[PDB]
Amino acid sequence: VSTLIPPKVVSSKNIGSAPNAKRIANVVHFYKSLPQGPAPAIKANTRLARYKAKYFDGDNASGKPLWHFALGIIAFGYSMEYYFH
Amino acid sequence: DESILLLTFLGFTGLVAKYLAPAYKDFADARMKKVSDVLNASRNKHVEAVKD
């Protein structure tokens, strides 16, 4: 007898599976995606964007800024020692 | 008197830079790698989902 009409009806496979949710996510995310992100920090300029760039970038974490930062406070109180003495 | 103390601090930063600063670099690197691998894994995963 005469075949039923379901095989030629589709209209809820688009909620029917899980990658639909991911699809509607990644059509927004990827379509308006940039090839590369914006920045790993770069502001501190006054001849100190260089200080941050050399020391406090993702390029390295090394003891050089620590030494520098320590020395600033040492220079304050060391001069003040002779202001107190 | 206090120049002896400042000398001790100079030594302290010397030991820190000798032992700790390369160790902390390696530690930080290790974690950074792990974060990155997970991130990139997620990117692969959604590429799979499109194909699915």
Describe the structure.
This is part of a larger assembly, with chains A (85 residues) and B (52 residues). Chain A has 85 residues and is mainly α. In chain A, 42% of the residues lie in helices and 0% in strands. Chain A contains three helices and no strands. The radius of gyration of chain A is 31 Å and the shape is rod-shaped. Chain A starts with 18 loop residues before the first helix and ends with a helix. By secondary structure, chain B is mainly α. In chain B, 96% of the residues lie in helices and 0% in strands. Chain B contains one helix and no strands. Classes of the chains: A mainly alpha (85), B mainly alpha (52).
Secondary-structure element pattern of chain A, one letter each: HHH
Secondary-structure content class of chain B: mainly alpha
Strand residue content of chain A: under 5%
Rg of chain B, rounded, reads 22 Å
Subcellular location (chain B): Mitochondrion; Mitochondrion inner membrane
Organism (chain B): Saccharomyces cerevisiae (strain ATCC 204508 / S288c) (Baker's yeast)
Protein name (chain B): ATP synthase subunit 4, mitochondrial
Family (chain B): Belongs to the eukaryotic ATPase B chain family.
Explain the layout of strands and helices.
This is part of a larger assembly, with chains A (85 residues) and B (52 residues).
Chain A: H1 19-29, H2 49-55, H3 64-81
Chain B: H1 2-51
Keywords (chain B): CF(0), Hydrogen ion transport, Ion transport, Membrane, Mitochondrion, Mitochondrion inner membrane, Phosphoprotein, Transit peptide, Transport
Subcellular location (chain B): Mitochondrion; Mitochondrion inner membrane
Protein name (chain B): ATP synthase subunit 4, mitochondrial
